[PDB]
Amino acid sequence: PVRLSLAPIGGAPFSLDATLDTVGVVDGDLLALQAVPSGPPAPRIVEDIADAAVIFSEARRRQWGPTHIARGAALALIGLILVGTGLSVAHRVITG
């Protein structure tokens, strides 16, 4: 149960009162059939300040997970090679 309207691709829906002239349609543009924008997002409300920390913090993608470790190892390695090389050459150019 929703309401629809017209909008140019890349812009916001057009008002239901304006005309296709005063809203600036050129003869041959490609309009899309999107919905009337929105309503309120209906804000939640939690009174216990304790759970006000666990609830409003999930929206982060925080989980440690066995993929923050994948990026972990490789990033450690590329550092090891680089300073592994530079040490020896510094052991090679300033001394011999």
Binding site: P1, V2, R3, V36, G39, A42
Partner: peptide, 18 residues
């Protein structure tokens, strides 16, 4: 309730498609 009460009294623009 907010799912019900809204199911049977949509904003005064949805009632065009009713």
């Amino acid at each position: 309730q907010r799912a019900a009460l809204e199911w049977s009294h949509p904003e005064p623009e949805v009632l065009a498609t009713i």
